[PDB]
Amino acid sequence: AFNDLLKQVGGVGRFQLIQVTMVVAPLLLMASHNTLQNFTAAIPPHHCRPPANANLGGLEAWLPLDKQGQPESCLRFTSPQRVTEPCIDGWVYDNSTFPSTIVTEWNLVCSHRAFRQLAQSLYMVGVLLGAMVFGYLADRLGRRKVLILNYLQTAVSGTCAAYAPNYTVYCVFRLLSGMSLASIAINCMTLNVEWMPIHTRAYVGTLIGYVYSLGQFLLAGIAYAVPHWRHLQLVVSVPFFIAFIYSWFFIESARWYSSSGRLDLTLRALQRVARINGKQEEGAKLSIEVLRTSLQKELASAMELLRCPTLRHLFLCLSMLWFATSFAYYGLVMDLQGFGVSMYLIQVIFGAVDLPAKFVCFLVINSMGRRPAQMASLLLAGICILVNGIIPKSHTIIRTSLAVLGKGCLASSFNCIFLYTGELYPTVIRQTGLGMGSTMARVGSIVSPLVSMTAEFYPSMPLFIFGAVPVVASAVTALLPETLGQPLPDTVQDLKSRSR
Template sequence: MDTESCMDGWIYDKSVFTSTIITEWDLVCGSRTLKQMAQSIYMAGVLVGAIVFGSLSDKFGRKSLLIWSCLQMAITGSCAAFSSNFTMYCVFRFLTGMALSGINLNCASLSVEWTPTKLRAAVGMVIGYSYSIGQFILAGLAYVIPDWRWLQLAVSVPYFIFFFYGWWFTESARWLATAGKLNQALKEMQKVARINGRKEEGDKLSIEDLRASLQKEMSSAKSTHTAADLVRTQSVRRISCCLCFVWFSTSFAYYGLAMDLQNFGVSIYLIQVVYGAVDIPAKLIGFFMISFIGRRVTQASALILAGLAILANIFVPQDLQTLRTLLAVFGKGCLAASFNCAFLYTGELYPTVIRQTGMGFVNTLARVGGIVAPLVQMTSEYLPSLPLIIYGAAPIVSGITTCFLPETRNMPLPDTIEDVERQRRSRVITDVGREDKVPLKASRLEPLKEII
């Protein structure tokens, strides 16, 4: 049947939002697909950012790239709020997505590389909760600020503050050591020692001590590391392959479940609050499992349970919306715990010399999962339950794949690729009491081991 385009414009429902990009540029009818394209462009930016900032951070350091990412987020996010056309908006959203990857990757690496083994799980949980708190804040801001331009500006301007106080961040001493910058590594370690109230122990450390204890890392720093190192040796290759499944399926199922939950007829504000609320118990349970059972079991359990929850919804009648919503929320909580564990687990599996490259690589796969997830919805035209089958099967398969990863609980962080291979051969868990924040092995440096 032939249709005629509207010649007199459109009247929009402004009961929830007074202004959106849809009402701003009339992304309806023949232009309705541009709304999904804008989101895909943003996710493409996150993907590109994971690749770019992942490798650059291993070359130029975590702190500098984190500061730059905050500045880029502030500028491009603010510029997006003042976009005069849809193309300009998409360009700035792409750059904002890149900055988001830079912030996520470098925050994760800095927290892993500066935190003692026994506290890594707790720090990871705190960082995970910051994301949950952000979901609550975003829901409140969206309710108070229903205009998209002002909302975009409200979530972008704070990054100028993050940029300015980011200069006081401490660069990773592990990265500085493996990069051969011993003088700066010594200064950063002594700075942390003062902050921790261990100034005397920090003052005992000298360049000669570092050079003697970090001879292996110094020799590794002389060689150039590339993305090819992610698959060069047997152990690292296995780690990379398994983590590809973990990150892709977690993101894939997460966004797929989010889109399915939006079809339940629940308020958009309530969905945002529920998404943040379910993270609290999920990440807390994940924290205890990570700390007392291990990373591998936690990762596998979270993925398999999420997949089973998604698949269970296939057999629940449409009129039982409460049960369907509970299963979806449970699955979302499991995926949130999976994300939380994956950040910590990945940082502990990859050695310092290629940690950011590895984090960037797996984050790239996660963004691919986020991009592919909406496309799976189109398979419902052939079989209504097919999207849920695909969304549920992916995390179950990756959960099984996780069993091929080594356990890192109570293990010191590897600094070189050779460390990873050595750990595979030995399969010996190092006592937590002997683990360093940076790999200081000389006995004369023992007092410093508790200050970093």
């Protein structure tokens, strides 16, 4: 087995530490890139600019007032103070907090407000495309080469977005940045796991969860330090140039070399790692014949998820769970400005709640089971979001606390569904099923900004939709079997025997 060779060349040695750390470091900026528009697309207060030929009755004589006494954002009087007209001459933006965003840069307000959400969706479209395209590319070219390309693409596209001369160019490059960043996240965990012993593989996924949580803190600090969107976009993008330079020194996974029919490449990688780990004597004992015997034994389709009636029910129910969790998650975390508290503080608190959420999810999963944990986390998240849509916006502390609880619950939902999905699918299709679940989540993050556009017509409709979907999904979990205390199924036959 390949695990025996890995233990022979050092187990979790110096090479594993160095390479895993270097590969995992860009996931710190992953959260910044995923939710950057909260700061780069922040919406400052705005109103119509008065006619140029007019002399400032003053500005108040030109602006109709809303029900709360504030000037209207999208209408001005045709004559100084009652015929209203849109902002023909543009808008005046309050620059006290956010001096420059893509909203102020390209006037993404009023009838053009939806372009802000379209840009977010196009980013998530790139994330979806990058998962599929670079998932195939990593298999043909290897994890190391694709990571090298992804770092360069992320650095170049993110920098180009910072220097975009118009909205269209910004969207194109944001989409390209999402393409490579999705591959970075996917191939970071594939490359690191393939170089780690099987009994340490769960720690790799756990460490990645801690890194993403730390990235939310990092975005808060960077955005607060760098308010200007062009500078902010640039500053989270150029670190990937550094990763691109040192990624050349990555060692491709010996397991991928063997699966590609290159044992001499497998041998060279293993001996290099043995040299780094101080196990040169063990590495010098390796040979193509030794590798051939060990990997002889080790060396279904996604359509079977729909062709098999037994696998179809699980796939459909899990797809709803994966979709809803992501759909509600990005519905909530991309609406930071809507809580009335400073977005930097909320971003900090949102990152902090991930840690107790995992601990509480860990406690519930092992005690009650995966199904009640998945049910409760989705149900409570939905209720929290739904109640947030009812409470008036003036109650900032209550609404923010509910949002934090809802965000923590959805983080627990993410933690449970990944573990639940693997124990639900048989070993023949488990990797395909986990990939299809992650795909459904990526679809949810595409749809979520689109639903957010409905706030233009009904201000509270997005929150109701973001809350209703997980509540419905919480009922879907009731159709799933409980996996706590069960052996992992191997074939679809095991699935039917378990049900019987």
